[PDB]
Amino acid sequence: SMDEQEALNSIMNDLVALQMQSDVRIKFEHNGERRIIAFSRPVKYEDVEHKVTTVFGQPLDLHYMNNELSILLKNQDDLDKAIDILDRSSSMKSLRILLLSQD
Amino acid sequence: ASATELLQDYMLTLRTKLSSQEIQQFAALLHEYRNGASIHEFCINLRQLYGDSRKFLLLGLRPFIPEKDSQHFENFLE
């Protein structure tokens, strides 16, 4: 429930703002299909996109899933930040990424 | 603000009807929308994640959507 409370708190603060190896393991989530793929450091963003396209056969958006640290990964920088977050966490063992289609 | 209760009832609905994972997933999308994402974008993401069984979630979210985006969110209903 730890992850749950932390989510519900995130949702609350968001709505209340209505108007005022050392390989990186990425857990991919696409229509209930978990897929864990490891990436060696240094992890390149375009290679991750490349991997998604191959494995899942269609262009998918990467939604980094971490309550108020969640973000649409659009660039090397975004990814490195997610990777850093995971490095400094005591509980997380993988980067969680929800896959959605842009259209 | 008189709508503090209307937030708690919505939080209550989420806590009581959504699985733990569906909450983390939703929190994540909701954070993107909060942080500058379009409404059209947000809706597309919701539609891929929440089918018929999760109408209440979408509905209960409506009054929390600002007027200008609200126009698009309502038609987004089935």
Resolution for the entry shown, Å: 2.3
Q: Which amino acid is at B72?
A: H
The residue to which tokens 């396209």 are assigned = A53
Asked if residue B78 lies in contact with residue B70, where contact means CB atoms within 8 angstroms, the answer is no
Chain B residues in contact with A101 by the CB 8 A cut-off are: 44, 48
Q: How many residues does chain B have?
A: 78
| φ/ψ of residue A28, rounded to 5 | -100, 135
| φ/ψ of residue A66, rounded to 5 | -160, 55
The residue to which tokens 């937030």 are assigned = B7
Angle separating helix axes A2-15 and B20-34, nearest 10 degrees: 30
Selecting from A11, A72, A98 the residue whose C-beta is nearest the C-beta of B30 gives A11
Query: Taking the domains of chain B in order of start, what are their residue ranges?
Result: 1-78
Residue ranges of B 50-69 with Cβ closer than 8 A to chain A: 64, 66
Secondary structure of residue A27 in the 3-state scheme: strand
Sort strands A24-30 and A33-39 into parallel, antiparallel or unpaired.
Answer: antiparallel
The residue to which tokens 């375009």 are assigned = A46
Chain A residues in contact with B66 by the CB 8 A cut-off are: 18-19
CB contact under 8 A, B7 and A64: no
B54 CA: distance to closest CA in chain A (Å): 15
Chain A residues in contact with B35 by the CB 8 A cut-off are: 71
Q: How far is CA B47 from CA A20, B16, B51, in A?
A: 27, 21, 6
Structure letter (DSSP) for residue A44: P
CATH topology of domain B1-78: Paired amphipathic helix 2 (pah2 repeat) (1.20.1160)
A38, A18, A16: which is closest to A83 by C-alpha?
A: A38
Query: Taking the domains of chain A in order of start, what are their residue ranges?
Result: 1-103
A11, A30, A13, A6: which is closest to A91 by C-alpha?
A: A6
| φ/ψ of residue B35, rounded to 5 | -95, 20
Conformation bin of residue B36: beta by default, left when phi > 0, alpha when psi is -120 to 50: left
Experimental method of this PDB entry: X-ray
Distance of alpha carbon B44 from alpha carbon B40, whole angstroms: 6
CB pairs under 8 A between A and B: 77
Sort strands A95-100 and A24-30 into parallel, antiparallel or unpaired.
Answer: parallel
